[PDB]
Amino acid sequence: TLQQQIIKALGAKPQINAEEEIRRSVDFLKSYLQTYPFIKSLVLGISGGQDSTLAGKLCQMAINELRLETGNESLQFIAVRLPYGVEQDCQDAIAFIQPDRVLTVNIKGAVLASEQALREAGIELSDFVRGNEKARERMKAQYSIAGMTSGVVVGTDHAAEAITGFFTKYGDGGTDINPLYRLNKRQGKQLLAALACPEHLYKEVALGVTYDNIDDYLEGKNVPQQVARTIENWYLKTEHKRRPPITVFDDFWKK
Ligand SMILES: Nc1ncnc2c1ncn2[C@@H]1O[C@H](COP(=O)(O)OP(=O)(O)OC[C@H]2O[C@@H]([n+]3cccc(C(=O)O)c3)[C@H](O)[C@@H]2O)[C@@H](O)[C@H]1O
Ligand SMILES: [Mg+2]
């Protein structure tokens, strides 16, 4: 079935052990940094929501352990707040993560500048397209920071978003390493609970399904046929987002 094929492709599991997965992600980040010792920083955009808070906690834990283990005082986790103009949840998230450094970059000025240049050329953006533009400016900011701090950009992509391609191509989807990949939405909550994250930090119509529908599907459960079709429709439609640019050698789009 397509469901079984998708589940395999995304590495999703019906049930996971919170603590064990926490260590799998942390050990992953630690191992990567020890393999590429020129990397001195982990950069992650924080929004005060479930995904970035979970990833952020794991990143700081990885950095904390590597410091104690190697003695390298130069390693650091950089949390980046990227507000558009002018949110107490972000402060709470920060207090929970206890990041080594927090940088605040307001992307409004740049986004308005990009839109003005486009407008003068004859292109007016719809609010929808402006949203992706915002996501890409956030990507740009994080990569500039990584470039100046010898770091890599950590992504928050997970199975529940990868399956529907619910991310901006080269926007929040533009990252270097994704420690949450394989987990579904509710499983991400499990990890946060295990980390004692303040409940309110992890507690939109675009899709024709709910996150419970998506997580159930990813867990291999029997869902109403039309819900399965909707989910698979999104998956098939967004394969280009989960693969490198298309070349004359590719044939996946021909099926
Ligand atoms: N090992 C690793 N594993 C995972 N991620 C890694 C990584 N090393 C770096 N990264 C990530 O990638 C980033 C570095 O890559 P990138 O941002 O490309 O930076 P970089 O590789 O330095 O790209 C710039 C080079 O491309 C040339 N360029 C660019 C564009 C157009 C043209 C032209 O001729 O028209 C030439 C430019 O002249 C220069 O030689 C790092 O900051 C980090 O975010
Ligand atoms: Mg997310």
Curated annotation (Swiss-Prot):
It holds the Pfam family NAD_synthase. It comes from the Bacteria. Its EC number is 6.3.1.5. InterPro entries: NAD/GMP_synthase, NAD_synthase, NH(3)-dep_NAD(+)_synth, Rossmann-like_a/b/a_fold. GO terms for biological process: 'de novo' NAD biosynthetic process from L-aspartate; DNA damage response; NAD biosynthetic process via the salvage pathway. Disulfide bonds: none annotated. Mg(2+) binds at D51, E161. CDD domains: NAD_synthase. This is NH(3)-dependent NAD(+) synthetase. It catalyses: deamido-NAD(+) + NH4(+) + ATP = AMP + diphosphate + NAD(+) + H(+). Keywords: ATP-binding, Ligase, Magnesium, Metal-binding, NAD, Nucleotide-binding, Phosphoprotein. One of its GO terms (cellular component) is cytosol. GO terms for molecular function: ATP binding; glutaminase activity; magnesium ion binding; NAD+ synthase (glutamine-hydrolyzing) activity; NAD+ synthase activity; protein homodimerization activity. ATP binds at G45, I46, S47, G48, G49, Q50, D51, S52, R81, T156, K185. It is an enzyme of class 6 (ligase). Pathway: Cofactor biosynthesis; NAD(+) biosynthesis; NAD(+) from deamido-NAD(+) (ammonia route): step 1/1. It comes from Escherichia coli (strain K12). Belongs to the NAD synthetase family. Homodimer. Catalyzes the ATP-dependent amidation of deamido-NAD to form NAD. Uses ammonia as a nitrogen source. Deamido-NAD(+) binds at Y32, N132, R136, K169, D176, H240, K241. May be phosphorylated.
